[PDB]
Design a protein around this nucleic acid. Structure first.
Length: 10
DNA sequence: GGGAAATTCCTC
DNA sequence: GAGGAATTTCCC
């Protein structure tokens, strides 16, 4: 749904 | 535990 | 519709 603002996971 | 980068969400 | 701005995570 709504993905917060951040750097992708490893 | 600090500095740097990627993707996302919103406006015009 | 494309660009600009804000927030979060990773490596050493």
């Amino acid at each position: 749904g709504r993905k917060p603002r951040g750097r992708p996971k490893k």
